[PDB]
Amino acid sequence: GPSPEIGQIVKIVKGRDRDQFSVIIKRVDDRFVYIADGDKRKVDRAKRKNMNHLKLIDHISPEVRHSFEETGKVTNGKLRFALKKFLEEHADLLKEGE
């Protein structure tokens, strides 16, 4: 199975923000990660999640990864922009959402 990566997009399967997209910002191991989206869940409220409660998406933000590699942190706004790029790719899949 694919191993979760820093900067990788997830869809939340179970949790407060079920069905919403988020970003992995820390990997404990392949079972537990921390997520934040910079909006509904800010970095200082990052949530520890069991991977059973997440769907890994095939999208990884190099900008988020760089921020962590160099400095060990990321801003909320950089997470929002990472998610926005994902949303832009899939706009036509999502445009009938209400």
Binding mask 2-41 for Cl ion (x = CB under 5 A): ----------x--xxx------------------------
Strand partners, 8: 60
Least separation in angstroms between residue 25's CB and Cl ion is: 13
Q: Which is nearer to Cl ion, 27 or 66 (CB)?
A: 27
Backbone angles phi, psi at 9, to 5 degrees: -75, 145
Least separation in angstroms between residue 32's CB and Cl ion is: 14
Residue 5 to residue 46: CA distance in whole angstroms: 15
Residue 42 to residue 2: CA distance in whole angstroms: 26
Distances (CA, A) of 97 to 32, 62, 90, 91: 30, 27, 12, 10
Least separation in angstroms between residue 70's CB and Cl ion is: 28
Residue written as tokens 């990997």?
27
Q: Which is nearer to Cl ion, 15 or 43 (CB)?
A: 15
Q: Which residue is nearest to Cl ion (CB)?
A: 15
**Residues binding Cl ion: what is the number (CB under 5 A)?**
4
Binding stretches for Cl ion (CB under 5 A): 12, 15-17
